[model samples]
Target: GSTATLLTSKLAGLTATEQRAVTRKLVLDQAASVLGYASTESLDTHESFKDLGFDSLTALELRDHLQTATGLNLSSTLIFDHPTPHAVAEHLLEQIPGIG
Candidate 1:
């Protein structure tokens, strides 16, 4: 299960930039594992992975991989909120504890 308390406490304390950094770091780290890419910037630089030969199944696998790594229950809506690693990271930082 996701460590809601731990996520809340740590995330709540992070500044906006810090949160983005954390998100970028985690996403990049995991994405590297999925795409066999060395860095997030490399992947982001690509106009489209699909155009570059990656497929839809690969994208789903990447999402599932990220969820497993972060222990965060990322909804499909994550894509809507975070179109880029930096943005996703920023949003993730803001998602601190509040559920009562």
Candidate 2:
């Protein structure tokens, strides 16, 4: 399970750009794992989650993982709110204390 403490600890020393990179990786990795993709490389940053085969359950699962990892009270419509990995990473960048 993902934990805010663990993620924050890892992100603490990173620059804003580095944090964004990690956020992007997090989204792609979670999507790949949840969607049964072979690897994160199989996903694209601008691809819509729905277009990439994410159903509501998987989307919600991704939201849960991110909420835990980021310590953010994310919306239930998180995937819809962000629409794509790049957008999701941008949202996450805003949530990180010093990374925004």
Candidate 3:
């Protein structure tokens, strides 16, 4: 239900930092939506998902949201393993492919 997959491949050709910018946005966007933030700007990437008040249900919602957006069959413990938005974004950037 997302057109992001199509654009993701295109964006795959971006510079490493460029790819990180958007992928971070993608992660933050989902996080914002799940946590009822006004915008992605409200999130500090270094802040833990736990610090952000994520529990099991909210974490799963964020994971599903991101998986849909990226068209990646992400791990169930995405939030569990990567405890912060910074780590989550960096981790997802790797999963996304390209722009090393």
Candidate 4:
């Protein structure tokens, strides 16, 4: 898989809302692919990723997809820091420059 550094203003150049949207898309898309569920469904409930059979490898791949989609080098630490797609989405939005 790949590693993401952090969000900066220039490199990815995404606004807060855009970043969150992209991240959510990537996570939901990958989850649907890996778990055979509909991406359009909500994964925000408690521990849904684990319920979807995501282990370390799948998690890392999910993070990489998030980076590619958003151009945000979100750290692997965000997995520990945020844990869920919804939480991480909110956290990444907060990290965006000029976010208010």
TM-scores of the candidates in the order shown:
0.62, 0.80, 0.80, 0.58
**What lDDT tens digits, residue by residue, belong to model 3 across residues 1-57?**
334565368457777667666767777889899889757757767788887767878
Model 4, span 1-100: residue lDDT tens: 2333443443255556666666555566755555566654645534556655666767677666566644556665455456666666656565554551
Root-mean-square deviation of Cα positions for candidate 3 versus the true structure, in angstroms: 2.7
| Highest-TM-score candidate | 2
Please give the RMSD of candidate 4 to the true structure.
5.1
Q: List ranges where model 4 is wrong by over 4 Å.
A: 1-26, 38-42, 45-48
Stretches of model 3 off by over 4 angstroms after superposition: 1-4
What is the total number of backbone clashes in candidate 4? Answer: 0
* Model 2 C-alpha lDDT per residue in residues 1-100, reported as the tens digit of each score: 2345556665787877777788788877887777887578678888888887776788888887678667766667787789887788778777766635
Q: Whose TM-score is higher: candidate 2's or candidate 3's?
A: 2
Show the lowest summed lDDT stretch of 10 residues, model 2. Answer: 1-10
Instruction: Order candidates by TM-score, high to low.
Output: 2, 3, 1, 4
Residue 7 Cα positional deviation in candidate 4, in Å, after optimal superposition: 11
Indicate whether candidate 1 or candidate 4 has the larger TM-score.
1
Please, what are the lDDT tens digits per residue for candidate 1 over residues 1-100?
Answer: 5664554555566665665666567666566666777665455522433432344565566566556655566755454345555555555554544421
C-alpha lDDT score of every prediction, in listed order: 0.55, 0.75, 0.73, 0.57
